[PDB]
């Protein structure tokens, strides 16, 4: 707390920006200047009234093109050609003229709802060291993901190509998921995130087109980091066996090889893969130079858990009663998602009370519920 003054200060910078912006738009945006008036005039004189969306199939280098409209009929259209002869390419949306169809203009951009799944609006409210602990196997993910974006200068002293690629692997719950989302808050470059259960589809032929796409968008914006979460999901998830099966899975893998490195020479696509089925992947996937430093994660050790548990209980109410050290004693090489589920379930004990204090009793009780999960899908009791 005690940050009220700085938030008011930020707010105050916001008041001033909203104000001057608004008045500037209002009436002193003066379009009584001829370089505004005369440019729009004779621009609208060739520009429509109905603007007849078309789809450009291909161009001809005689100032013509063949469009196919979604309404139906094709047309062999001219081009007014103050629009830069060579700036438009197959797949463009073009403005045709309501009279003789000429390319009045060209729309710069258009998008799909299938790339909406890919792209993101988010801005995580967690930044790194809410991944506090495991703090030397995270120098392998911020020296080959973060750093060459931040400094290419270091890799120029040595020269040769800079890093490319990582595969994260280890036990589930050991932070793989949050590692990827934590470098993306630092770097502030286009963060794509795609689940591997959407790369597996119940329809064929569109599988490869999806996988081919991710990196083509990704190269198109000059920096991007593509998180493929769960590439362990490509051999264990499958729908029907007559449009899924071996075939679907083989093709998509094949596509990814060309995309990941292949012959495309696409833009920067730093890749992050989470997996714990690394032996269901190709040898041309886990091939070096697409994985450069690969990171192994195992369960923390006793003193590492102390780092983990203190991160989690800072958000909570505390007392002098609370003792973190004896919660550590009980657990023995377990995940940090287990530790994280004790602190989440400790406030569920406080919720149950409707008492806003968190005490050593609440942490020990949820410890027992957490250990109830581990050994009661077990039915041996003692190792038979």
């Amino acid at each position: 707390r005690c940050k009220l003054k700085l938030l008011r200060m930020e707010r105050i910078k916001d008041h001033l920006l909203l104000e001057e912006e608004f008045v500037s738009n209002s009436e002193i945006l003066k379009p009584f200047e001829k370089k505004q008036e005369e440019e729009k005039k004779q621009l609208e004189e060739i520009r429509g009234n109905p603007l007849s969306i078309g789809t450009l199939e291909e161009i001809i280098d005689d100032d013509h093109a063949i469009v196919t409209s979604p309404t139906m009929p094709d047309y062999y259209v001219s081009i007014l050609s103050f629009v830069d002869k060579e700036l438009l390419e197959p797949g463009c949306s073009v403005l045709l003229h309501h009279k003789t169809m000429s390319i009045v203009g060209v729309l710069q951009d258009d998008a799909d709802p299938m790339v909406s799944v890919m792209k993101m609006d988010k801005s995580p409210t967690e930044s790194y060291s809410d991944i506090g602990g495991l703090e030397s196997q995270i120098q392998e993910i911020k020296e080959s993901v973060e750093l060459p974006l931040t400094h290419p200068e270091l890799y120029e002293e040595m020269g040769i190509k800079p890093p490319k690629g990582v595969i994260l692997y280890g036990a589930p719950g050991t932070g793989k998921t949050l590692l990827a989302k934590a470098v993306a808050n630092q770097t502030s470059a286009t963060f794509l995130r795609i689940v591997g259960s959407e790369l597996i589809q119940k329809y064929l032929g569109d599988g490869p087109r999806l996988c081919r796409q991710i990196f083509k968008v990704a190269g198109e914006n000059a920096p991007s980091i593509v998180f493929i979460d769960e590439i362990d999901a490509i051999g264990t998830k499958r729908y029907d066996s007559n449009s899924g099966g071996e075939r679907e899975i083989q093709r998509t893998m094949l596509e990814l090889l060309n995309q990941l490195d292949g012959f495309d020479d696409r833009g920067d696509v730093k890749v992050i893969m989470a997996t714990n089925k690394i032996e269901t992947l190709d040898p041309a996937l886990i091939r070096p130079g697409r994985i450069d430093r690969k990171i192994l994660f195992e369960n923390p050790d006793l003193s590492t858990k102390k780092k983990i548990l203190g991160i989690h209980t800072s958000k909570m109410n505390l007392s002098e009663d609370v003792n973190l050290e004896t919660l550590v004693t009980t657990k023995d090489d377990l995940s940090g998602a287990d530790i994280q589920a004790m602190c989440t379930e400790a406030g569920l004990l406080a919720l149950r009370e409707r008492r806003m204090q968190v005490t050593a009793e609440d942490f020990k009780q949820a410890k027992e519920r957490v250990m109830k999960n581990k050994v009661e899908e077990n039915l041996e009791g003692l190792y038979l």
């Binding site: 109905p50 603007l51 007849s52 969306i53 979604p70 309404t71 403005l95």
Partner: protein, 51 residues
Amino acid sequence: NDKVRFIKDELRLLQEPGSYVGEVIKIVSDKKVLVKVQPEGKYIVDVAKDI
């Protein structure tokens, strides 16, 4: 008189060129609207003075 001059006026009113239903996909800040006509495709077209 109110009655007979309402009929005579409705004869004009009923005569149309066709007036459609569209739906706005998105605007563009040239003061134009991309409208997908529900049966038909998309056309960027200007707007009236009442909107």
